[PDB]
């Protein structure tokens, strides 16, 4: 029985100056104990190797959209993976989901971030369109 966490949106956040949009996460599935969503980040409590996966559903004409998944810890930021998607320029046609995943060594005390590097990104709060998850391997 592997530890898992599957997270869906409660809300969006984007501050004025930043050129960044993030998602506030809430669990719909968990087993085992090594992880905890706190607002728009996930805290890592147990060191180990984890499968991390991220999907965001966009409805946004910005020529490219996507997300950047990182871990911060011990005074050091590292990008784990990015998903990038070209978008149609017509608002009514501009839908795309962006899915990426990988397996990474996360350490106790790390913070995982999921950032859309545009301000006020138009993205779905649907639990089946946008989500974020972990499996401890």
């Amino acid at each position: 029985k592997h530890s898992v966490l599957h997270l869906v949106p409660v809300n969006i956040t984007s501050k004025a100056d930043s050129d960044v949009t993030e998602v506030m996460w809430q669990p719909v599935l968990r087993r085992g104990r090594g992880l905890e969503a706190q607002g728009d980040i996930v805290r890592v409590w147990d060191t180990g190797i984890y499968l991390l996966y991220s999907q965001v559903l966009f409805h946004d004409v910005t020529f490219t959209m996507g997300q950047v998944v990182s871990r911060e810890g011990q005074g050091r930021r590292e990008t784990l993976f990015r998903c990038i998607r070209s978008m149609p320029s017509d608002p009514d046609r501009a839908y795309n989901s962006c899915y990426s995943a990988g397996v990474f060594h996360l350490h106790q005390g790390d913070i995982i971030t999921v950032k859309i590097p545009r301000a006020n990104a138009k993205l779905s709060l649907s639990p089946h369109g946008t989500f974020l998850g972990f499996v401890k391997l």
Binding site: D17, D60, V61, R82, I84, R118, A119
Partner: protein
Amino acid sequence: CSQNEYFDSLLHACIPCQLRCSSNTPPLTCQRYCNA
């Protein structure tokens, strides 16, 4: 990056500002260029 470009943190590249002008909120560097 050079004049009228921004460093796009998603693409890790320098991109012309005109690509972001007619689309929601452009990056902060670009905002002056996108008006006048």
